[PDB]
Design a protein around this ligand. Sequence first.
Ligand code: HEM
Length: 152
Amino acid sequence: GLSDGEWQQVLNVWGKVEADIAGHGQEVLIRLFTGHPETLEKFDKFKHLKTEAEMKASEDLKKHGTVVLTALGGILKKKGHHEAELKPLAQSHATKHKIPIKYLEFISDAIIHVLHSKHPGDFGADAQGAMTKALELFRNDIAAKYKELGFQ
Ligand code: HEM
């Protein structure tokens, strides 16, 4: 649950992402894959990437970063009223991709890391607080659907 002022901060931060969605999406995925190499094994289409240079050179990885961040942005713009948008993603991630909730924690922290890396000094303490709460709400509503499905 976020206040109106917190949502305003989230959507202000998101404007930084929307100016270069593919560059942000690329770096989020590279941070996830290099920090947590077990996450790469869930992607049949990326497991061939052995080095970060190959990851950086991969246009398909940048494409997938765009898909991921476009979906997240659509959810964030609902300011918590995201049941219809979140349900299919929860269902596909539990039943088809088999993504443990832990990996959604990893990607949440990776988003915070990338924002500080690309906008140093321009991602303030209030903005980090609001973004973190928004990613927690997203993860918590996914977790509720995971529990319904019995997925661990
Ligand atoms: C911010 C969180 C994330 C969002 C919004 C997101 C969004 C999406 C979307 C929109 C798709 C394509 C449609 C679908 O299959 O449902 C996708 C595919 C996928 N997601 Fe996620 N995702 C997230 C986090 C993750 C994480 C943490 C992992 C794994 C570590 C992951 C693994 C996958 C995989 C394996 C695919 C299929 C890729 C394919 O082979 O083309 N997702 N995701």
